[PDB]
Amino acid sequence: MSSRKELANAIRALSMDAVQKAKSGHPGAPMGMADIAEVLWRDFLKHNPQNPSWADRDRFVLSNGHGSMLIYSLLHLTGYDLPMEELKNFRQLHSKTPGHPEVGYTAGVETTTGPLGQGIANAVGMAIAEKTLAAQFNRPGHDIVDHYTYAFMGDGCMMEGISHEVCSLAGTLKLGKLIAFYDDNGISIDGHVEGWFTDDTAMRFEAYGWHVIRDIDGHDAASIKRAVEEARAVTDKPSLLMCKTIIGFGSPNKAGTHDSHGAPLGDAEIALTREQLGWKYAPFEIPSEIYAQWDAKEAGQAKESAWNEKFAAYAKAYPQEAAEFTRRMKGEMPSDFDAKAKEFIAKLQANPAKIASRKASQNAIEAFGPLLPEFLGGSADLAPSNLTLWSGSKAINEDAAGNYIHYGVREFGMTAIANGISLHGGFLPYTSTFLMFVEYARNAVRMAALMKQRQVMVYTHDSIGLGEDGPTHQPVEQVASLRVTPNMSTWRPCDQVESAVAWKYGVERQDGPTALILSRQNLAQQERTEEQLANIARGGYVLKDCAGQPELIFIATGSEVELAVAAYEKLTAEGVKARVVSMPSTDAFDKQDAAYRESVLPKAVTARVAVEAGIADYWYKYVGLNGAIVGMTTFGESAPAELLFEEFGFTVDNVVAKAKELL
Amino acid sequence: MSSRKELANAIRALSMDAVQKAKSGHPGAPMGMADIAEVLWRDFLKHNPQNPSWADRDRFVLSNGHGSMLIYSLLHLTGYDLPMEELKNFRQLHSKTPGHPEVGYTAGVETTTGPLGQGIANAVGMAIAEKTLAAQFNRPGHDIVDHYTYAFMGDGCMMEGISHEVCSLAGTLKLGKLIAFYDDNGISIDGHVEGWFTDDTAMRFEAYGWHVIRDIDGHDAASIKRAVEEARAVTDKPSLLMCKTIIGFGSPNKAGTHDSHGAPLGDAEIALTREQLGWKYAPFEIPSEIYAQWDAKEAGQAKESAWNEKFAAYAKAYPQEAAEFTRRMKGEMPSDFDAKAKEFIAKLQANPAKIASRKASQNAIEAFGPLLPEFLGGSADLAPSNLTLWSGSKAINEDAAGNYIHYGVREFGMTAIANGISLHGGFLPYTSTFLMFVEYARNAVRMAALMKQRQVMVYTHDSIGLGEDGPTHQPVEQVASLRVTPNMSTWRPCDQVESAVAWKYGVERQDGPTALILSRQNLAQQERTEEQLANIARGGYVLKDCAGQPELIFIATGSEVELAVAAYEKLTAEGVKARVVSMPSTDAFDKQDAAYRESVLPKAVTARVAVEAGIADYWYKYVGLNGAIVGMTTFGESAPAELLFEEFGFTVDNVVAKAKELL
Ligand SMILES: CC1=C(CCOP(=O)(O)OP(=O)(O)O)S/C(=C(/O)CO)N1Cc1cnc(C)nc1N
Ligand SMILES: CC1=C(CCOP(=O)(O)OP(=O)(O)O)S/C(=C(/O)CO)N1Cc1cnc(C)nc1N
Ligand SMILES: [Mg+2]
Ligand SMILES: [Mg+2]
Secondary structure (H helix, E strand, O other), X not given: OOOHHHHHHHHHHHHHHHHHHHOOOOOHHHHHHHHHHHHHHHHHOOOOOOOOOOOOOOEEEEOOOOOHHHHHHHHHHHOOOOOHHHHOOOOOOOOOOOOOOOOOOOOOOOOOOOOXXXXXXXXXXXXXXHHHHHHHHOEOOXXXXXXXXXXXXXXHHHHOHHHHHHHHHHHHOOOOOEEEEEEEOOEXXXXXXXXXXXXXXXXXXXXXXXXXXXXXXXXXXXXXXXXXXXXXXXXXOOEEEEEEOOOOOOOOOOOOOHHHOOOOOOHHHHHHHHHHHOOOOOOOOOOHHHHHHHOOHHHHHHHHHHHHHHHHHHHHHOHHHHHHHHXXXXXXXXXXXXXXXXXXXXXXXXXXXXXXXXXXXHHHHHHHOOOOOOEEEEEOOOHHHHHOOOOOOOEOOOOOOOOEEEOOOOHHHHHHHHHHHHHHOOOEEEEEEEHHHHHHHHHHHHHHHHOOOOXXXXXEOOOHHHOOOOOXXXXXXXXXXXXXXXXXXXXXXOOHHHHHHHHHHHHHOOOOOEEEEEOOOEEOOOOOOHHXXXXXXXXXXXXXXXXXXXXXXXXXXXXXXXXXXXXXXXXXXXXXXXXXXXXXXXXXXXXXOHHHHHHHOOOOOOOEEEEEEEEHHHHHHHHOOOOEEEEEOOOOOOOOHHHHHHHOXXXXXXXXXXXXXXX | OOOHHHHHHHHHHHHHHHHHHHOOOOOHHHHHHHHHHHHHHHHHOOXXXXXXXXXXXXXXXXXXXXXXXXXXXXXXXXOOOOOHHHHOOOOOOOOOOOOOOOOOOOOOOOOOOOOOOHHHHHHHHHHHHHHHHHHHHOEOOEOOOOOOEEEEEOHHHHHOHHHHHHXXXXXXXXXXXXXXXXXXXXXXXXEEHHHOXXXXXXXXXXXXXXXXXXEEEOOOHHHHHHHHHHHHHOOOOOEEEEEEOOOOOOOOOOOOOHHHOOOOOOHHHHHHHHHHHOOXXXXXXXXXXXXXXXXXXXXXXXXXXXXXXXXXXXXXXXXXXXXXXXXXXXXXXXXXXXXXXXXXXXXXXXXXXOEEHHHHHHHHHHHHHXXXXXXXXXXXXXXXXXXXXXXXXXXOOOOOOOOEEEOOXXXXXXXXXHHHHHHHOOOEEEEEEEHHHHHHHHHHHHHHHHOOOOOEEEEEOOOHHHOOXXXXXXXXXXXXXXXXXXXXXXXXXXXXXXXXXXXXXXXXXXXXXEEEEEOOOEEOOOOOOHHHHHHHHHOOEEEEOOOOOOOEEEEEOHHHHHHHHHHHHHHHHHOOOEEEEEOOOHHHHHOOOHHHHHHHOOOOOOOEEEEEEEEHHHHHXXXXXXXXXXXXXXXXXXXXXXXXXXXXXXXXHHHHHHHHOOO
């Protein structure tokens, strides 16, 4: 017979007690948002704790991810597979309750947050995925896609620039099933936010085309419930609920203070908080009657069973559509994709074309597009330069059943939206910008790798080869930054064949992202045997060789393979024993077993010459201390590209000369 | 005899002709903004072409930097040292007219733009610098600081998240002398912007607290002038002028189209444009009467001479303050700073303390603060964690003559604002956040290095040593990314003494930024001779040694130096000739003479073991192919730091074992 406030206080108790036992963590936000979470989760959220993978569940995102005990409490109380022992192991090694929530670690966590702002970006992507999937698959009388995307966010997320990027786009795309709750508590780590944060946030979001509900009492369940009902009734705009809350609600001495944000309350303060809240139970003790009101297993089972019957009827009327929905929601590839993609790759090798690898990428999209209806691609206002459109592209701002997103000049927001799209299921996202401006999206790229998400990242104009735009645009050190990122795959293809191989590798990579490093300028196609063609996917392989132990091994990537081969030919004609290794993917090469790596870069050969129009320091990993590196050590310059390659030493004469110093 | 429209058409002609001659560049925005520029530069801008370094000049920033021929036209026409021959060498190797404007390359260019959004961020920083410098130095009857900051920006800047960060903060700080012109032309690279950009931008900026002037006819001099007059009369709010323009104005067939954005118009179209504009002059022909109306040399010298006389009277009344103003505007250090800082460093070595290097950083700020009144420091909402406040910090939102900025949760905007502060003159900015979230500001960090700007970047919580917050917060590969950035200095100090040396190195840099990599946890102080103490500033030095040529060299940084020393003690006791090298700065080490680097890392010693809680791949540069690396190869985990170091191999047993594998 517990009131709604008592049910919300169960969150407050678990959160402050788990933080206290860990001696680490953030009690303030869970305590401030517990009443909002109680209304959302018990009255509106459509979910099944017994199947967190239900395709048509509502999605919930905690963008203020430091309040991780909020989501752990909700998952535990509603009946997910997250036992009380895991809450007692909050922030402990290998527990299911890490200090910030991580997808895959924990039943029912939808995304990994912690980096402020990216949660709401992920939620925008999930709402775009639902809207697009519903438009693609729903049929008259068979609305098999119909779910909401709810997000919690705080002052930190609102101040971050990425909130502007993704909430602006969400207004453009009229994401009426996206409902965000703003924890308007007036506190951040430096103290009272008025010293640095004075936006009329409601007016700002109305400028984006959002429906905004002002001045909600975040500690009054009836007020919260009425607001959510209003937001769900507005079907043509995303909704922002401005919830006035007290951080650390319940703590007599730390509520409303920055002290409650990110440190344990302390045992004496917790005792006083129990007395103020009227919460009598000991740490990690929850009575059966409170579990009875929180549990979602019976309602969740019933809702998913109803949906399963709806999907079964859909599968009868629309069998091919239903098979595709199941395939795409599972992330499985079409059964014939491997064979058709290999046939395309073989055709390219047999039919040389000297084209830019950005064009080879577009040709792969055109080839794979008819086979991968799950593609949801886009570019950050650079479709005619990145070459991301194919004949079958259809912008979703024109047709909601389309497959292409004009992201605007929003690299960070684009990449984190795409993380939300990949997390949702049903799609294979690709994103695109000039390689330099990956630096604007850098942490979302890292988050894709950390979350093991499939996304193809199409990064063009990869070096001084772009020419006159100059050093603010010319990448030098960006590829190295990607190569040292754990679980990132990075490909710098040297011709149209390596480009198609890299695209196939990316779409088939189920457990992490793949960045394609693509040229502005035309790249010569290299000759390959059948064995060499198959070895491209091994990341590094012997392209040109000699009999016996080489005196020199050239290691080259991308547009510089043509230069390395030319130097190899000059040296071979003078009687030098040389080898050329093409290294389109250092990460794929590193994953090959020791025997294969020894066959490509034998330990006996120390005279190694790396050639790449990128930062030189990276290449010590493969050249060692007794070789040479023909690379960049400076920023670029504004000039025609052919003059730049000459000025910076990417000439046959310089490569030959640096190699001869090792003989 | 020339009308204002004919004067603006000189910009149009020079811009379209120089783009055509280069067969490269962006004619549309210069042609669209030429009328706005004519009014701003001829009727309002206070500047002297004969001294572009005049301390009290207005600052102009082209945030839509692809329109570079706009600023080159203006600088040439008003009389700067930018001859017609340089405009005929637009985008050519070593010209003063690179494809995007670069500070230092060209008289009168205030900042380097090209990366969208960062120009307006730099402008916010310049306006903060002017407001703060005025508060510090102006005296009754002596207002020696009084100038405006004017910025041009387009749709790309408005879409970028950084515009939200810096314009939100500009509203909070009430930057009444900041006036921005929005080129509202409806076009971006993908086409008509309504498919991806639908903000009520005026309402958005009113939410920031800006004064906004809607619906300006950007091709009508009277409308523009009236709007600028209104914006200058609003002294307590930054102003945004919504200028409706036609991109490529004048071109019958490409005006208002994405085609005019980023490609030469073509010879035929330029001829049609001359006819439509009524422009009768050949390419690169400007008649003397048009120069006479544009030239700013006479008026600008009069204005600067008037200011010189004002400063002289200030110096009579306030001689110590005038001397400081001159010193700080020139960027010179106090003459006794070197000696006083060395005294502080020596005191630290003689009085050992085991403290976190973030605390040692705070202690260096406390020691240097009284000596460097030019400090204008801040943190992105992490003052209590980064430890950026000292006893003399005064926030400028409380006291305009202060020295500290609460930046809010805005890492990218903070860093690009600080670039504007350093470009303005008068200050030495420092910025700060958790090291992980440098990834949010990555391209602004790069721009500081590219522009050769002095800024100290204080990055704390540098490894898995931060503990329970987990892998979204624990840096692994970020330090390696900074280390390979051209013209970046990166320091990872191992105790409070190395931390003080690194701070001294950073503030004494005259030509680039310095990133400090600082621990959460306490670091033991190392014993040093006088020679070792002096060699910290060489970036790498011998900390522990043997007699004769070493058999084994440990190379360690930051918090892992203690681990390396413990392994050294174990192997030394066994009778191994071991050495420990402390490498707080790889870039300072690399710049040393070859004999010094050989004395530290002798080329004959291949048994090298690098030890650092960061990505392993970086260290091949110093250990080669025949050593060992005790580093990270994965993301982190949420757990207490002591357990993480054990789990990931940062133990004496593992370091010793990897060393014995080389012997
Ligand atoms: C600055 C910061 C916080 C501000 C919190 O203020 P808030 O209004 O969102 O939250 P509460 O009201 O809950 O205090 S939470 C936090 C953490 O490191 C922990 O994730 N950090 C550092 C941080 C900085 N920058 C980014 C991109 N992410 C972060 N997590
Ligand atoms: C997308 C993009 C531009 C369009 C900008 O449209 P706009 O409205 O600002 O300008 P116009 O009206 O003048 O079309 S200009 C351009 C370039 O690379 C060139 O700098 N880029 C790519 C680009 C992407 N992201 C960033 C951060 N900077 C860029 N310069
Ligand atoms: Mg808050
Ligand atoms: Mg535009």
